[PDB]
């Protein structure tokens, strides 16, 4: 550690320092009487750290013998993760208090998970990748199971823990093979050794194990079956978190690994990523048709959308990475909007999650249904929504790389998936006899629905430089 | 008959298979992950070392 | 003569055994926690084997951190199992099945 | 390796020797003492009256949480042994890095204590 190393990781130290101080403040000055105050200070902390990461002048570099990489790619990913995490906490604050779920440790656990994500996207070494991933994963298991009186929370944590641990073991086994072949954990050393003429079955086995281990975290098929059960079982605020911030961090990590460690064997891993993307797009679309629980529908929506994002990465190009980044940004915005509405659903003062509760909602609350309509067409990828332009970008990358067969399959699965988004619109606007679901939203939760919904249309006019920012970020990674 | 047979006969039939495979049993989900790795390893082996 | 391949073979056997324990167990979630520990032990055998045969300490450093996460995983795994047992009265794998579809 | 042969082979040899001594002591009575088992003799002891049940029932462990924290604290102390052995050669970062590491440990320990996790359920 030099003073230059410490400066590079300063945003991470600031977040880590806050988490420790918040833990002591909550323990010694009121415990749950500070729970509401700690949640909102955490939201400010996430935004402050994002400002440190994203604002001012930045010069790309590395710290700690290359184990930590501070480049434009990692800065793009961190900002989206932190802002998405801040959004989920802010919009869920009222819901958790009403449901007697706001422990003063919940904001802190989320903060340490985000800290793990920040080390994931800036990994320049296999050990940094692992420690960042495991700090995030352990925090995610806890919040999945934090509704103690719910057998479904306990089962969600149990399934996530067991399958997450299995994927982590596979990731470690591949990481051990890669280290044995290359003689080092640093990616700059690894990339120089993994090249066309020297790929033994052993090192190719290592890549497969690492890829499969990571593809679990983005719910790629057939490493996806945890997602529907965990999404259903966990508290809806925790489900909203799983759907936005970890997926962005995990998707960026996969791009970091395949380009900074396996960037000279693109041909080998591009085919595997494409096969994952195909299976995820069709299963997510087909399985989503059979869902009656809205939370469980969003899991299959999540799986299908990660398949599309993987199409951009399967391209193996700077444009593919640029468009994968924009896709994840737009996907996170859409999920924040949708889960803001899902949190509000309730009948007789208790939360409700079944799709039939939406019948004729458009004639109960016109503005909220109109927002939900824009989000469903945005998730379906239909113009003029910003969700369409996300799909357009990854499809552009695929065709640009001579993978039109992947683009054709991608758009076909989109048609199947469009059915269950259309069905939600059908229920709200011309559905069957209504059972009195009401949407309870405070000011913050209300803006968590409207602003993402407005962004789906305003973004169609101007992306406000985000598309250009993603291109610069992709260049620093791919080179 | 063809259009409805595909849109309303086939795709729902594939939906029911997908729902069935999501059995809810933890050991089945782990089996799927192991089948995925084993299948991918078979794919890598056929391409060979190179 | 014992070379690297000997240790990798032992690692592979323990690794497959630990993976096998997860997706064949039905009656006890604690035995799954034991299988996860077998799987991570197999990983450390690889890291130590590669480390000593290369003459490098990184693999041994990696092993120390795998133990750290293994300890944290066991603590959280048992804590999650405790809350399930309280809510269900059982820890059989076949009983972690309410959510499906 | 010489270090293995000179220092660790004796451990393996003595492990067998100590095992042989313990086994011979058990077999001494097994071969010499009179064996005369009957159903009352081999039944379970509960102070003269028959046991209500055997000892294969669930039992609440009121120190379960402390035992989970025992696992965590075990790994924390493990990082100190290489540090203590290397103490003479430590750099300034290596020294104060441990102090930061131990400070994070103490925050966790203060959280357990204040929460009440060290009191039995
Ligand atoms: C900016 C700091 C947060 C101030 C928030 C003001 C809200 C007022 C409030 O009620 O909560 C403040 C709270 C202390 O709670 P207080 O209400 O004073 O307790 C009463 C005693 N029972 O204060 C808190 O909740 C403090 C939370 C900890 C903030 C950590 C600050 C350090 C940041 C990390 C830097 C790391 C650098 C290395
Ligand atoms: C106080 C300030 C709050 C935090 C704001 C951080 C600002 C970060 C930022 O602008 O980063 C810039 C970065 C690109 O940087 P660069 O390419 O260098 O730009 C050229 C500069 N010369 O740009 C990026 O990295 C792009 C980041 C885009 C973020 C998109 C949003 C992510 C998902 C969250 C949606 C939130 C929904 C709203 C919720 C409502 C309430 C619940
Ligand atoms: C994506 C976008 C996401 C952003 C959306 C933002 C929406 C606007 C938020 C509105 C203002 C905050 C919410 C106000 C509120 O409800 O107050 C929370 C809390 C009240 O406390 P109390 O009433 O005691 O609650 C317990 C009993 N119910 O008291 C508070 O208000 C808590 C203190 C306010 C928050 C902190 C402000 C100070 C800045 C702290 C910076 C972080 C410090 C760490 C970083 C250090 C940097 C070096
Ligand atoms: C009613 C009749 C409907 C029949 C289907 C309609 C045809 C759909 C074809 C879509 C267009 C694909 C295309 O033009 O090919 C993509 C690509 C050409 O691009 P390329 O030369 O790689 O340029 C790289 C840029 N640097 O690659 C090629 O050169 C051709 C790749 C073809 C990909 C498969 C096309 C199958 C057609 C669809 C079958 C039905 C579904
Ligand atoms: C643990 C997580 C919580 C972290 C919160 C506390 C951060 C560290 C303590 C605060 C002061 C550190 C200032 C560093 C000074 C410097 O750069 O010069 C070194 C300085 C010499 O550098 P020079 O000035 O370049 O010669 O060395 C020293 O004398 C001090 C060494 C301290 C080592 C502490 C290591 C821990 C910090 C890394 C945290 C990990 C990320 C967490 C996520
Ligand atoms: C996409 C559309 C296609 C969706 C269907 C995919 C499944 C194809 C069949 C493979 C599994 C065969 C065994 C189970 C058959 C179900 C049945 O009737 O038994 C009930 C039965 C439940 O019985 P119970 O659990 O004993 O009550 O199902 C099972 O036993 C589940 C089998 C688990 C092990 C195999 C897991 C395979 C994972 C598949 C993930 C998706 C990959 C392929 C799709 C990619 C997209 C193109
Ligand atoms: Ca690169």
Which features would summarize this protein structure in a list?
part of a larger assembly; 4 chains; A: 479 residues; mainly alpha; three-stranded antiparallel β-sheet; two-stranded antiparallel ribbon; 74% helix; globular; C: 101 residues; 3 helices; 0% strand; elongated; binds 1,2-Distearoyl-sn-glycerophosphoethanolamine; binds 1,2-diacyl-glycerol-3-SN-phosphate; binds calcium ion
Number of helices of chain B: 2
Mind describing the biggest β-sheet of chain B? none
Helix fraction bin of chain B: over 70%
Helical residue percent of chain C? over 70%
Which series of helices and strands of chain B comes N to C?
A: HH
Number of helices of chain C: 3
Distance between the termini of chain B: 50 Å
Decide which structural class fits the backbone of chain C.
mainly alpha
Secondary structure class of chain B reads: mainly alpha
Catalytic activity (chain D): a quinone + NADH + 5 H(+)(in) = a quinol + NAD(+) + 4 H(+)(out)
Subunit structure (chain D): NDH-1 is composed of 14 different subunits. Subunits NuoA, H, J, K, L, M, N constitute the membrane sector of the complex.
Family (chain D): Belongs to the complex I subunit 3 family.
Subcellular location (chain D): Cell inner membrane; Cell membrane; Membrane
Structure description:
The structure is cut from a larger assembly and holds chains A (479 residues), B (50 residues), C (101 residues) and D (121 residues). By secondary structure, chain B is mainly α. Chain B is 84% helix and 0% strand. Chain B is built from two helices and no strands. Chain B has helices at residues 2-21, 26-47. The relative contact order of chain B is 0.07. With 101 residues, chain C is an all-alpha fold. Helices cover 77% and strands 0% of the residues of chain C. Chain C contains three helices and no strands. Chain C has helices at 4-24, 29-54, 58-88. In chain C, 37% of the residues are buried. The longest helix of chain D has 31 residues, at 2-32. Chain D is flat, with a radius of gyration of 26 Å. Chains in contact: A-B, A-C, A-D, B-C, C-D. Chain A binds chain B through residues 158-159, 162-163, 166-167, 170, 196, 199-201, 204-205, 208-209, 212, 216, 222-223, 225-226, 228-229, 268, 272, 275, 283, 286-287, 289-290, 416, and chain B through 11-12, 14-16, 18-19, 22, 24, 26, 28-30, 32-33, 35-37, 40-41, 43-45, 47-50. One 1,2-Distearoyl-sn-glycerophosphoethanolamine binds next to α3, α4, α14, α18 and α19 of chain A.
């Amino acid at each position: 550690m030099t003073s230059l190393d410490f400066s590079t990781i300063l945003p991470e130290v600031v977040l880590a320092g806050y988490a420790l101080a918040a833990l002591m403040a909550g323990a010694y000055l009121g415990k749950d009487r500070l729970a509401r105050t700690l949640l909102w200070v955490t939201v400010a902390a996430f935004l402050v750290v994002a400002a440190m990461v994203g604002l001012g002048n930045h010069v790309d570099g590395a710290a700690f013998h290359g184990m930590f990489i501070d480049d434009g790619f990692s800065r793009f990913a961190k900002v989206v993760t932190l802002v998405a995490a801040a959004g989920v906490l802010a919009m869920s604050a009222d819901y958790m208090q009403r449901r007697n779920m706001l422990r003063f440790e919940f904001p802190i656990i989320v903060a340490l998970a985000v800290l793990g994500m920040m080390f994931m996207v800036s990994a320049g070494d296999l050990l940094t990748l692992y420690m960042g991933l495991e700090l995030q994963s352990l925090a995610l298991y806890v919040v999945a199971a934090m509704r103690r009186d719910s057998v479904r929370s306990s089962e969600a944590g149990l399934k996530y823990f067991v399958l997450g641990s299995l994927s982590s073991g596979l990731l470690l086994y591949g990481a051990s093979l890669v280290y044995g072949f290359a003689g080092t954990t640093g990616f700059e050393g690894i990339i120089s050794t993994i090249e066309a003429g020297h790929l033994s079955l052993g090192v190719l086995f290592g890549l497969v194990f690492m890829l499969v281990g990571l593809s679990f975290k983005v719910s790629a098929v057939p490493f996806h079956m945890w997602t529907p059960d965990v999404y259903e079982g966990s508290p809806t605020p925790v489900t909203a978190f799983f759907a936005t911030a970890p997926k962005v961090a995990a998707m960026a990590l996969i791009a970091r690994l395949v380009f900074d460690a396996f960037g000279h064997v693109i041909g080998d891993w591009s085919q595997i990523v494409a096969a994952l993307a195909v299976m995820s797009m069709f299963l997510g679309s087909i399985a989503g048709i059979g869902q009656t629980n809205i939370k469980r529908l969003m899991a299959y929506s999540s799986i299908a959308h990660m398949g599309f994002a993987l199409v951009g990465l399967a391209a193996g190009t700077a444009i593919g990475v640029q468009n994968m980044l924009l896709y994840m940004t737009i996907y996170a915005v859409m999920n924040i909007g949708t889960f803001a509405f899902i949190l509000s659903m309730e009948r007789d003062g208790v939360p409700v999650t079944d799709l039939a509760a939406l019948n004729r909602f458009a004639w109960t609350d016109p503005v909220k249904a109109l927002a939900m309509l824009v989000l469903m067409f945005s998730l379906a990828g239909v113009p003029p929504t910003l969700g369409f332009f996300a799909k357009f970008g990854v499809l552009t990358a695929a065709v640009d790389a001579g993978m039109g067969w992947l683009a054709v399959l991608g758009v076909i699965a989109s048609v199947i998936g469009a059915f269950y988004y259309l069905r939600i619109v059908y229920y709200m606007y011309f559905g069957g006899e209504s059972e009195g679901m009401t949407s309870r939203m405070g000011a913050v939760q209300y803006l968590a629905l409207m602003v993402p919904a407005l962004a789906m249309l305003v973004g169609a006019i101007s992306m406000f430089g985000v598309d250009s920012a993603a291109g610069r970020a992709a260049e620093t990674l791919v080179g | 008959g063809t259009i409805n047979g595909v849109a309303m006969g086939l795709i729902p039939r594939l939906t029911r298979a997908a729902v069935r495979v999501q059995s809810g049993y933890l050991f089945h989900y782990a089996f799927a992950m192991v089948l995925g790795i084993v299948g991918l390893l078979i794919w890598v082996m056929m391409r060979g070392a190179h | 003569m014992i070379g690297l391949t000997h240790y990798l073979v032992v690692g592979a056997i323990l690794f497959v055994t630990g993976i096998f324990g997860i997706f064949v167990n039905r009656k006890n979630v604690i035995v799954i926690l034991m299988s996860i520990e077998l799987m991570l032990l197999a990983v450390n055998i690889n890291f130590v084997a590669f480390s000593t045969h290369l003459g490098d300490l990184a693999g041994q450093v990696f092993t120390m951190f795998v133990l750290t996460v293994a300890a944290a995983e066991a603590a959280i795994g048992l804590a999650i199992l405790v809350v399930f047992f309280r809510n269900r009265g059982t820890i059989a794998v076949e009983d972690v099945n309410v959510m499906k579809g | 390796m010489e270090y293995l042969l000179q220092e660790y082979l004796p451990i393996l040899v003595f492990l067998g020797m100590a095992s042989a001594l313990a086994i011979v002591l058990i077999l001494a009575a097994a071969v010499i003492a009179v064996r005369n088992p009957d159903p009352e003799k081999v039944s379970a002891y509960e102070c003269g009256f028959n046991a209500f049940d055997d000892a294969r029932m669930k039992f609440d462990v009121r120190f379960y949480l402390v035992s989970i924290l025992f696992i965590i604290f075990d790994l924390e102390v493990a990082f100190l042994f290489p540090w203590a052995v290397s103490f003479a050669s430590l750099s300034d970062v290596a020294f104060w890095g441990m102090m930061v590491f131990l400070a994070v440990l103490t925050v966790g320990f203060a959280y357990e204590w204040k929460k009440g996790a060290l009191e039995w359920a």
